[PDB]
Each structure stands twice: as C-alpha cells, then as structure tokens.
RNA sequence: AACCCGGGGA
RNA sequence: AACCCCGGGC
C-alpha cells in the first residue's frame, strides 16, 4: 500500500463541484514530498481518512517520527484533496513555526467549506505563516499522478483525459480562492 | 384518513433540492371526486408500494367503488411526482374507457422533467383530455384545507409556508411550459 | 454524496 | 436526498 491505486486517484482528487451517482465519500487524502535542499533522495508517501478526521495532524506526527536532521533544510509539499480545517491550519502553523527548517507549500484539490468564515480565516492563517496555500491544476494533477500513482498496471481510464478534466474543473475553485484572498485585503 | 401539517410540508416540499437533514420525498397522491349531481365528494390519498405506483393504485381503488357508469364525475389529483410514462398510458386508456370520469391532474415536482420519455408522458395525458399543470397557490391552497388535519396545530406558520410553496412553484411552472410545444 | 442560493436541459 | 451542466456565497 505504498502508491495510490489509478482508480484511488480518479476517485479521491475528483474536484466536481459535486458527486455523481452513484456516490462515494470524497474522503481527506493527504500527498506529501519531502525533498532535502542538499540533494538527497526525497520521501514521499500519503495519509487517508474519513473528511471528518484530521489527515493534516497525522502527516505532523509522521513528519516527527522521521527525526530529521534539523541542521538541513527541507521544501514540504503537500497535495490535499480537501483544504484543512480551522484547528488544523492553526496546527500546521505551529508545527512551522516551531521547526523553521522545514518550507511547506500547501496545494488542495477541492475548498474545503470556503463559504464558511471560520475556514477561510484558517487558509489566511496559513498564507500569512509562510505556509502558502494554492487550488490544483494542471502541474500539481500531473505530478501527483507520476509520483504517487501505481503506474505497473494501466488505468481503465485515459490518464491524459482525466487530467484535462480536472484542469478545467479547478479553474472555478482558484477563481473562488481569489476572491477569498481578496476580501482579506479590505 | 388525513394527512399531518408536517406530511404536507415534507412530501409537497417543492424545492429544486432538499435541505439537509435529507428525507425520503416520495410519492404522494391526493385525489377529489365529485358528482356532477351534488353528492358528497369523495377524498382519499395514496402512496406508492414497492411494486404498484400510487396512479395504478388510484386507479384500481376508483374501480373498486363500483361508481354509477351513468353518472358524470369530476377528478381532481394532486401529485407529488408528476406521472411516469407507465402510469400516464394506463391514466389514459383507463379515462378513455371511463368518459364518464374528467380528469385533471396538478404535479406539485416535476418528475425526471428532463428525461425525453417522461416528458411524453405528460404531453400525452394533455393530448388525451387531461389538462397536467404545476400546483400553484390555489392548488397547495385547496390541498392544505381539504387533506390536512386541523385538529392539531403545526409547528410552522401554514400561510408563511403556503407562500413559499407558490414561489418555488416559479420556476417549476417555467419548465412545464417549456415542455408544451410539441 | 462537505453546505446554501440562482439558471438551464437538444 | 429524482439527474446532469453552469454561476455565486458579508
Ligand atoms: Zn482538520
Ligand atoms: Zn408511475
């Protein structure tokens, strides 16, 4: 169970605004990327639980049972199928702040509650820690499949077909996160 | 039997999409017939069964009362769903058997509006003599006084609620125009 | 099936 | 929780 399956991919990074029948939980499914700045090989590897659960609190304590060495520099990237919640963000900043070698950018498939006050504020909180938080597209898709996906058997699905689907899809939700990145600035 | 004021929310609920928490909207049938000749109407509603839609069943429970075939009566439905394509060509033929029966028919939804089959359905029963149209204020009006119990208060403001039911009633009557145009 | 509102469906 | 598509949410 180390990469994702190519129907785990379709199904959980699927950014419709809505499910289509017949329906399945878009669960919390969290990518991470670690890539040491002097070079080393990177780890990757992902978390997945029920959205009710707290993916981004897990990868913090399996970040932690790494022990890494805090005299490197390390650049996090994070792909999450769905944005973090408030007490999350406010986790994930603390952790930061508390481990200032480690750079994590954070990039999310869906916007999680976005027209809720609490969960916007918590994605400004993580902008304005150093933490920045971007909507998927076409680059972040991509790497995702390459690097996270199980590629020895093929997908039932066209992988470049998928992936245009899911481009188009996320130009709704970065239009959305603008506008909640605007009203900050008032 | 009658129908509580919160069966006639939840079931003749009109919105585009029902609000959590999620209920069932099913099938709901309310019919009134009445004689030319002056009698005492006859009420009475009815719910689908796992395998017969409340239209069979309607119109098996008119056959049952053994009505005067010489008579005239006039049927008024108010409907939940809009009728399937089954139940629409088995209103007809049992209308066209029965002439001493008109029928009209109010559909609070919509039913599948945008599948090509069922819109048929609906245009025939227009073709065959009986006149489909949304429920509006008048219809929900008539509905609530005529199948609700009074004896019990509801736990919301029935002209309040009333009010909302013909506002929803918009767009779902824009849609059924649509459809009428051959 | 994260939530609401609005429009449409040859 | 009848379906699909689109737009928006101090
Ligand atoms: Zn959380
Ligand atoms: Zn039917």
Avoid at 22 to 48: D, V
Avoid at 83 to 100: M, N, T, Y
Avoid at 134 to 141: A, H, K, N, Q
Wanted: charged share 25%; glycine share 4%; with cysteine.
């Amino acid at each position: 169970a180390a990469l994702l399956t190519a129907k785990t991919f379709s199904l959980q990074f699927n950014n419709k605004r809505r499910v289509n029948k017949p329906y399945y939980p878009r669960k919390a499914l969290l990518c991470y990327q670690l890539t040491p700045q002097n070079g080393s090989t990177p780890t990757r590897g992902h978390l997945i639980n029920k959205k009710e659960d707290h993916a981004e609190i897990r990868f913090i304590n399996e970040i932690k049972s790494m022990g890494l060495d805090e005299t490197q520099c390390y650049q996090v990237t994070c792909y999450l199928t769905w944005s973090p919640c408030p007490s999350c963000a406010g986790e994930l900043v603390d952790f930061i702040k508390a481990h200032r070698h480690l750079n994590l950018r954070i990039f999310a498939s869906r916007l999680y509650y976005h027209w809720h006050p609490n969960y916007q504020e918590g994605l400004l909180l993580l902008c304005g820690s150093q933490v920045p938080v971007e909507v998927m597209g076409l680059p972040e898709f991509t790497d995702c499949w390459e690097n996270f996906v199980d590629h020895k058997e093929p997908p039932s699905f066209n992988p470049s077909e998928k992936l245009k689907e899911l481009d188009k899809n996320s130009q709704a939700i970065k239009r959305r996160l603008e506008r909640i990145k605007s009203r900050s600035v008032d």
